[PDB]
């Protein structure tokens, strides 16, 4: 996984969401040396058009901030976010916090700062997405377990069966009707 993360950088689709100019140019050139697929866009659109894995943007005190914010709010949560920052003062930093960046690059940008930030930010966003996915799986699991257990008590008590017998019956019907054990359980309940 550090190994697979590093090995898949050349398949990432990176978008430099920033005005045309020297900064965008230097950033796009360093993302092409690293080997990512890189596009540059400006003014911020309303939806992406093509799948995007990582966005680099700057912090604007104007309507592109809200556009960018809305653009990524509606977007795929696994989209990694990196902000180019030139001020350390509270309104600018609050903007970074509200956008919920996964990484930052303070200006002036230079090639040495890019790869370490892209990798650490990508690990970060992927780890966030995984914890959220585990959270849903576990929520579903706790609920499932409960209905398998209440259905088992139901069979036990209905038929004068032990736990093992109730379990064998659920499994058997389940795997004879090509459906989840949970469906059988919920049918009973």
């Amino acid at each position: 996984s550090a190994n697979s993360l590093l090995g898949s950088l050349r398949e990432l689709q990176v978008l430099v969401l920033n005005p045309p100019g020297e900064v965008s140019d230097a950033l796009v050139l360093q993302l092409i040396r690293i080997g990512c697929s890189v596009r540059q866009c400006w003014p911020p659109p309303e939806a992406f058009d093509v799948p995007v894995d990582v966005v680099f943007t700057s912090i604007f005190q104007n309507r592109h901030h809200d556009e960018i914010a809305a653009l990524l709010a509606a977007g795929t949560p696994r989209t990694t976010l990196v902000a180019l920052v030139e001020y350390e003062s509270p309104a600018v930093l609050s903007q970074i916090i509200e956008l919920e960046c996964h990484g930052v690059i303070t200006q002036p940008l230079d090639a040495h700062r890019v790869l370490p930030v892209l990798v650490s930010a990508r690990r970060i966003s992927e780890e966030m997405a995984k914890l959220k996915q585990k959270t849903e799986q576990l929520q579903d699991r706790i609920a499932g377990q409960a209905r398998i257990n209440q259905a088992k008590v139901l069979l036990m008590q209905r038929h004068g069966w032990d736990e093992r017998e109730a379990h064998q019956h659920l499994s058997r019907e389940a795997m004879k009707r090509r459906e989840p054990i949970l469906k059988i359980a919920q049918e009973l309940l």
Binding site: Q157, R158, H159, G160
Partner: protein
């Protein structure tokens, strides 16, 4: 000596039904003595009062067999009193007639079972109850083996047929006042559709009266019992007793000449404090069978009398009965009755024919009873 030992309590928790059994047995002796006794010699009886105590039953059985030469006994009611006597009769090669309903699961070469096993009373009653009453039930029984075994089956039957057994309550055999009040409050708090009682003897009447008063004298759940007899219903106010449900092979209201003849015979012979019950009926027919088997054998030898027992199908007050040689149990009628407002037992269902006994059946198939009840 043609001497029958009668082991029925006169005092104690089940004194009423057992006095009833004693007089039923005495009624038979009297009739047998008018039919020629046993080979010219009159049939004699010997009675002792064990007072519902299993150890006193054993001691009375032992006195009779050891010191009085008794080899033929009629007696016992509560199952542990039967268990206490059984070994004494088996070691003496004696014969005991048990004219009492019981939990089943017993075979004794020396016991002639004149009362129904669970396939003959509880099963039909379970089918009936699940058929006509709501499926939320509350159980209340006396704390000894029979109500407990009887609840063990009924609990399983209700759960198998989509019912809920809300509370399963037990009270001591001579239940204090507090015992009753606590029990009735639980019954009242469960809001059951039906009350299945297995309470036996003294305290039955008070129990049914307390359920009555407790409820807001309003469409209480009906009480269905496996144990309540005519002796308990006579101690109940008319309105308490009304609509209660009861099961037995015989009811004094049966509409036949044979039943009519038994009522009349009991009315002119039984004391004032001895009500006719289904167990007086069973003591009567069993005691009658003993006498006729002895008359057919020409002697009073257990071996000779016993042989002639399985071959004599009798015309009992309940209808026709016989004892099966394979298991010492009997083929018995089975009636389910609802008590009307004047304290009379109205038979609501009857098995089309006498039910053959199967004391060891574990799975009671309620479908057996679909045709005759619906």
């Amino acid at each position: 000596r043609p001497l029958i030992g009668l082991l029925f309590s006169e005092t104690g928790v089940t004194a009423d039904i057992e006095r009833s059994q004693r007089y039923g047995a005495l009624l038979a002796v009297e009739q047998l003595n008018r039919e020629g006794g046993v080979g010219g010699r009159p049939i004699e009886t010997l009675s002792q009062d064990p007072g519902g105590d299993p150890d006193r039953y054993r001691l009375c059985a032992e006195d009779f067999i050891r010191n009085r030469g008794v080899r033929f006994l009629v007696g016992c009611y509560m199952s542990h009193t039967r268990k206490a006597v059984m070994p004494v009769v088996e070691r003496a090669d004696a014969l005991l007639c048990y004219p009492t309903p019981y939990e089943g699961f017993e075979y004794s070469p020396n016991i002639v079972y004149g009362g129904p096993a669970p396939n003959q009373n509880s099963a039909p009653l379970a089918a009936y109850l699940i058929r006509h009453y709501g499926e939320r039930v509350v159980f209340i029984g006396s704390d000894y083996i029979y109500p407990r075994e009887s609840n063990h089956v009924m609990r399983h039957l209700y759960r198998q047929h989509g019912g809920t057994v809300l509370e399963e309550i037990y009270i001591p055999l001579y239940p204090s006042d507090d015992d009753l009040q606590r029990a009735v409050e639980r019954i009242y708090q469960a809001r059951a559709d039906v009350v299945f009682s297995t309470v036996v003897g003294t305290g039955t009447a008070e129990l049914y009266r307390a359920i009555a008063r407790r409820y807001g004298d309003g469409r209480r759940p009906p009480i269905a019992s496996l144990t309540t007899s005519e002796a308990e219903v006579a101690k109940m106010e008319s309105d308490v007793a009304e609509g209660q449900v009861v099961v037995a092979p015989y009811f004094s209201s049966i509409d036949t000449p044979a039943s009519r003849a038994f009522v009349q015979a009991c009315h002119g012979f039984f004391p004032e404090n001895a009500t006719i019950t289904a167990w007086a009926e069973a003591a009567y027919w069993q005691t009658l069978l003993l006498g006729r088997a002895a008359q057919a054998a020409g002697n009073w030898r257990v071996e000779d009398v016993q042989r002639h027992l399985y071959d004599i199908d009798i015309d009992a007050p309940q209808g026709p009965v016989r004892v099966e040689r394979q298991n010492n149990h009997s083929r018995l009628s089975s009636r389910i009755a609802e008590i009307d407002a004047r304290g009379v037992f109205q038979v609501r269902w009857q098995s089309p024919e006498p039910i053959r006994p199967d004391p060891y059946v574990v799975v009671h198939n309620l479908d057996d009873w679909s045709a005759s009840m619906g």
